[PDB]
Amino acid sequence: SHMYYSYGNYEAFARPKKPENVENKSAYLIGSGLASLAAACFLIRDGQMEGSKIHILEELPKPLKGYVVRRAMENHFECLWDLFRSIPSLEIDNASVLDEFYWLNKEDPNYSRCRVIEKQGQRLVTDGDFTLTKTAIKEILDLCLTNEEDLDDVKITDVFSDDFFNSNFWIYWKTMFAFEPWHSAMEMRRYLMRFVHHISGLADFSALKFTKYNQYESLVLPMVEYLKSHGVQFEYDVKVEDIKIDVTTSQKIAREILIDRNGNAESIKLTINDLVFVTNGSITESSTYGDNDTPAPPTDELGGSWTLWKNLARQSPEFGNPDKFCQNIPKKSWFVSATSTTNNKEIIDTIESICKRDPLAGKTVTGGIITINDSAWQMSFTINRQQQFKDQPENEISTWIYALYSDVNGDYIKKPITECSGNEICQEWLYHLGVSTDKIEDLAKHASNTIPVYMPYITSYFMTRAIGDRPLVVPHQSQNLAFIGNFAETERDTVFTTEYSVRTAMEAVYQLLNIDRGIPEVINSPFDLRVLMDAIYELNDHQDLREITKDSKMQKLALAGFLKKIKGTYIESLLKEHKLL
Amino acid sequence: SHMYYSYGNYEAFARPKKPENVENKSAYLIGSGLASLAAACFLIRDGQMEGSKIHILEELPKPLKGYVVRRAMENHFECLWDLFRSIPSLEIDNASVLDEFYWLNKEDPNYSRCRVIEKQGQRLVTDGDFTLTKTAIKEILDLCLTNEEDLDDVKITDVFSDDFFNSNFWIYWKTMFAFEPWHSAMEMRRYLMRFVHHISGLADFSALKFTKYNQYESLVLPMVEYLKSHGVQFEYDVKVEDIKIDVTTSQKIAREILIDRNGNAESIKLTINDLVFVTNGSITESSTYGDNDTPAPPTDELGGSWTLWKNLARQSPEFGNPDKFCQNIPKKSWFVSATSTTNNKEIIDTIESICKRDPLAGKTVTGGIITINDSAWQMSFTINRQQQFKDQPENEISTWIYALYSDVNGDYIKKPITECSGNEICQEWLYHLGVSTDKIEDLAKHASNTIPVYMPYITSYFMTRAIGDRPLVVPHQSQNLAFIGNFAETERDTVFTTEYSVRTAMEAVYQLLNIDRGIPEVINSPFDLRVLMDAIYELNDHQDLREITKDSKMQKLALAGFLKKIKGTYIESLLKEHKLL
């Protein structure tokens, strides 16, 4: 391809030459999403493009009656870090967003003290172990051994059986990633191989890393200062309708950008030197907002994002199939998310007794999400390093809440979550905290300002896709078109991840300009001996190779002959090295 | 330990905090070798130490009747690149030594057009294939499967048999690395695992990378400008005798540095805050020099380096056993190296017709070493990107020559190489180039200025060592002592390598100061599925799994059952992925 993957320090520290003919090129970026911001940043640094020639078109210009909170990173987001190492931070002087992040998660590491709760406040008894049976472990192995071509339109409830589902591993997995039974077995197979190196840190969120303030403040805003420092243009109130593309038998050239600047109908014309970066699709689209007194109105609208993707699919199949992601989303699926802000010391005291940490402390609180396992909504909540907003009073905590089931009645508020307001969500949440039934309706109506948010497309990432549903970053024979974001296709990496946004960003800029530098490959942990032995030891709840085959005569007979061969050699020393012998 | 290994972009780009209490610390560096220069550089950048407090003691101050040339790098010298990414180059403005190196080897890649020659000029017939038989491949596998503890004082002629030795693979291996039959099987086992990822590029030197000018100009001098830019002290004509060390049952503290500054006998006293970095041993020690008319006088002296290592061994076994490296070196071993500089167009024309490239071109010439396979001295030569010296006339080429056998008579100059002058070496070399017997004595005596160099310790790196012969970088319970260089011990990495000098440099600075940053691990290619399948395909001269077992009924029967299991799964698709099915 116009590209090559690499995996070294040689490729990482090196600076690529200024790409040929970039002194006569312009680039247009569709949407102000985090992927576009990264693609524009890559055009500045590595592509050495002019700042006066990078245009970012957004529908938004410059209300809301409360605070709203919008997952964590991990060390091996290899493309996210090549970017923020070059982004000067907004807090600590002469140190990059990486540096401030790097130090902050070393000074205050992340770990969950109470990961799962049940029975209205109590800590889950088997919290820690995976409760994976011999059958469940095998279906995990078979799914990874299953080729990805043999997973077209294959749901998760077709690869696993009961043994896997009634386990803590499924509880830990579906809740930190927001997976659904009817979701793509193709993507979960990617997630299993993607994060096989932190599988020990799955039960306790030890391999997670959070920023200081919220995603806007710590990630988006440092980028925006970097971009405007270089003169990058920010077009506001620009809605993109369609993009005329010439798909000849030889090329694919973009020509027009049919926009609606505020109210006027205009159009930008593109040569072959005018690059276009389309963030096709959006999970944040068509989100409604409620308050502490009214539910967020449920909607199913097609926003300008999907209609933009739709208008390109009717121009070539190679530009993707949007309908598999935004149509036929089960009405049970995740739609509602909430944010309860409160200073009432009795709710913060209740949270303290569960998560074992002072929430009003500036340190870690929950360590991640805390899953109410027996809750009807299958609802989870998290509390990050308060205050999460830079100008929020230093005696308030902001709690993010979501639920995976949206058409079942709550155990206390006997109705679906799409029918509930802020205080009705706040009431069902507090009841599961163990708060007394007497102080439930008051502490939610008058003490906590809970904001519910309905997004009809939040699970569009994980829909059951097929080979060809997601478009390539740079389609075959394309000259100035690129698709970025989590509905673009690349190799092995996982969507619903800020890494995926910066991956397809860095792959789009590097291909269209042919930059003489390698792109960091998805970490090779799934092909690493040492990482895979660790997975077998951790999947079996810390059992050596003898204890795993002590009840199988057909297995313990094959192992005994295996140990005879590798006895006294590197393999046997590598097997005690990773606790397997 | 005081340390942790890491393998990511997260750890690579990040800057570590200023180590505690470094504002009251001093460091002393023993010798001006490349390892010390790196340790001092690491004290400046990562340790944030003062420049006025880094002392580099050297025996040399500020003749020689000719030019002298002193191996190549590879992409996965993970510690060498964390260093030069921060070293400003001396040629291209505002670009580091890494950058100028990175671009230079992309603009002009390296590859050997004629790797082995024989029969006085002709190209070897089987050049390319490994000629590894089924037995030879297995001894390779067994040696790696052999634990490293089971290799104490084990020579190379005890792990391999005849089948391995009469092969091109042995010819390619012993000559680019300067291995000997009687050398350590422990280190070759490390070399096999170290470079298992470039095994395809072993026959053609395609994975090699050279600098522009010589090692002094392109590596040492950029470092020295960086160090003196920060005020690092350079003590010249300082010979270090002994270093008094307090090895109590609890600690190991250095106290005195017994030196001989020029002629005076002085001594520096060390608190626990005065760090010491000892480059224990030296292959360059006690080197004599000849000219085009007289042989370099053979010597066996103990230089101030070995006597310094000796004086520390009589203070603790944990500081190493120097005698295994500098005593009992076989008199057949490599000692003589040469450098033939000439402008005579008939010698450069002869080289052109063999290496297939214009030597007087500024590009690649030989691509690496060219081995004269049937030569008595087992002599090899290389010609790098002339001119290799910054102020050398643009019509001269400088040819480096060495030989592995030093007590056998040459095929033309019927005497050992330790008896030969510059022109006698130049005559034996030209005879093997195919130059006519008539124009052999003239073109070497009057056309070429060949300088012979005798170093009695060049093969000290690869001597048959045992666990405990090489000291740890930071011995147990040590407080201010560190041993750097290729006679220090670390994990998995290989000596006789500029990576090893910068590895133990970066490990010494990071442990003594406890820097909050990981050290890049030796590349995990020997534990990488994809890299190991590639090795089996490349070791068998590009044969798939069917052709490797077509003559073994006990093997083809086990494979047929193996292919039944993994059929249609990831493993089988990964096996065509790497040409194995």
Author numbering:
A (entry chain A), B (entry chain A): -1 to 60, 71 to 78, 81 to 591
Copy text verbatim from the article accompanying this structure deposition.
Flavin adenine dinucleotide (FAD)-dependent bacterial oleate hydratases (OhyAs) catalyze the addition of water to isolated fatty acid carbon–carbon double bonds. Staphylococcus aureus uses OhyA to counteract the host innate immune response by inactivating antimicrobial unsaturated fatty acids. In this study, we deduced the catalytic mechanism of OhyA from multiple structures of S. aureus OhyA in binary and ternary complexes with combinations of ligands along with biochemical analyses of relevant mutants. We conclude that OhyA accelerates acid-catalyzed alkene hydration by positioning the fatty acid double bond to attack the active site hydronium ion, followed by the addition of water to the transient carbocation intermediate.
Glu82 in the active site Loop (RGGREM) is critical for activity, and we mutated this residue to slow catalysis and capture complexes that were not obtained with the wild-type enzyme. The substrate-free state shows Arg81 is the gatekeeper that controls fatty acid entrance to the active site. The specific activity of OhyA(Y201F) was ∼10-fold lower than OhyA, and OhyA(E82A) was a >100-fold less active. The importance of Glu82 in creating the hydronium ion is evidenced from the severely compromised catalytic activity of OhyA(E82A). It is instructive that OhyA(E82A) activity is not zero illustrating that positioning of the buried water by the α7 dipole and the arrival of the protonated substrate carboxyl at the active site also contribute to catalysis.
